[PDB]
Amino acid sequence: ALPVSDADPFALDVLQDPLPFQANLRDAGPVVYLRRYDVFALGRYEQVHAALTDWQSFQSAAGVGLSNFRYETPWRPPSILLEADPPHHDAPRAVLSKILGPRALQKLRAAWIQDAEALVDQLLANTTEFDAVTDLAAAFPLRVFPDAVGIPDAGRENLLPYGDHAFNAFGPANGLVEKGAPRVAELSGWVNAQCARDALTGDGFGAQIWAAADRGDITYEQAPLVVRSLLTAGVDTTVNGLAAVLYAFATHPDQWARLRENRTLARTAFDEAVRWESPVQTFFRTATRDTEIGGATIPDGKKILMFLGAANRDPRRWENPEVFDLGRNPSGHVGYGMGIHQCVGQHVARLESEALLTALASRVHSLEIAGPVHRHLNNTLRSWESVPVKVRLP
Ligand code: HEM
Ligand SMILES: CCc1ccc(C(=O)O)cc1
């Protein structure tokens, strides 16, 4: 009965430009069987939302990549947040929810704002033409987030590769994964080292996680894996979200002026970029029982592929979805997911954006694309390689 398709969402040509595919997915029906992978794809907002929230029907503990941990060996000990269901999910989630929550981040705001202003000021002192990825979007998270976690300086060059491999590894064992598999032992080796109590400053998120373990909120065994979650999820996502927002502003002069005309728009600017780009494209779930969704039965034990990018551009939910518009209300986009696993780092992402955008807006009159943009292909993370920009100063 279902629409059925030979489309490969992880083919390089789709990864380079996934918008065609998303439209085809959404157009085919609520539920498309991807024969290539024996999973059920969902591309419309309504079903993606329903699948995300229904953790009882659609579990995470069997893996939220293609790989089914029922049968297949994980490349790493699975995340005790992302790949855990209730009740195991609950305690580590609650720890991060508190540590990364708005109240907690309040104390970092002025420092991050300040660090962003310094970054931008020093960049613009040297040059008004530069790569928005390497000089801003990549630079700024690396300058603030590792320090805030409180890991040592040694080995920080592993953060982006580690993150990229983890997101690739949610995909099939295709070239993007298999070309990374030599390096994982040394990648996994480093990150585990950063997660130990003795490797971490006694100030940052890491120390706070360990302090939560002292109170018994989590165990000393969970504590380093909780730190690990931050070091997997917390860097590459924000780099690519920041690249997207910068790309959006550089191609939308009116939206840029609107930001400049009201600095409180940063928050909603970043959230709209998250909707519009959807840096995290896809996640899987595993059906725990035969389940009806969008008219289709998902057999017990089979995986659903949720297309967050496609749901975020679904015209059933969004007016003129292709447009980047800070006048839009993007609240309810599924770019951070939805329900019990909804991104716990969203306050962290929004603050980085607020800091960087405020700093940029203070010093840049207008912003243009200065040269060809280039994507970095990844199975699950829409990644920006280069975004040459030129700025005009006041
Ligand atoms: C633009 C930035 C970000 C995007 C687009 C993003 C996206 C996501 C999405 C889609 C999920 C849901 C996973 C699922 O449903 O299976 C998620 C979960 C998560 N994110 Fe984020 N994220 C971002 C930034 C961050 C940051 C800065 C951190 C940490 C500081 C972080 C940590 C996490 C964690 C630990 C989870 C798992 C939570 C759970 O399973 O309960 N993310 N993120
Ligand atoms: C942002 C998607 C994501 C969420 C959590 C993890 C992790 O816990 O390692 C890794 C990736």
Residue numbers in the entry: 7 to 400
Paper text:
We recently identified PbdA, a P450 from Rhodococcus jostii RHA1, and PbdB, its cognate reductase, which catalyze the O-demethylation of para-methoxylated benzoates (p-MBAs) to initiate growth of RHA1 on these compounds. PbdA is a member of the CYP199A family, which appears to have evolved to O-demethylate p-MBAs. Atomic-resolution structures of PbdA in complex with p-MBA, p-ethylbenzoate, and veratrate revealed a cluster of three residues that form hydrogen bonds with the substrates’ carboxylate: Ser87, Ser237, and Arg84. Similar to the substrate-bound structures of CYP199A2 and CYP1994, all three structures were in a closed conformation, with the F and G helices occluding the substrate access channel.
PbdA also catalyzed the hydroxylation and dehydrogenation of p-ethylbenzoate even though RHA1 did not grow on this compound. To investigate how widespread these activities are in the CYP199A subfamily, we characterized the ability of PbdA to bind and transform p-EB. PbdA bound p-EB with close to the same affinity as p-MBA, its preferred substrate. The transformation of p-EB by PbdAB was remarkably well-coupled to NADH consumption. Moreover, the apparent kcat/KM of PbdAB for p-EB was within 50% that for p-MBA. Finally, we analyzed the products of p-EB oxidation by RHA1 resting cells induced to express the PbdAB system. Both desaturation and hydroxylation products were detected, along with acetyl and epoxide derivatives presumably produced through secondary oxidation of the desaturation product. Despite the efficient oxidation of p-EB by PbdAB, RHA1 did not grow on this compound. PbdAB also efficiently catalyzed the hydroxylation and desaturation of p-EB, as reported in CYP199A4 (21). However, derivatives of Pseudomonas sp. B13 were evolved to utilize p-EB as a sole substrate via meta-cleavage, overcoming both regulation and enzyme inhibition, both of which are bottlenecks in its degradation by the WT strain. It is therefore likely that the high affinity and specificity of PbdA for p-EB reflect its chemical similarity to p-MBA and this is not a physiologically relevant reaction.
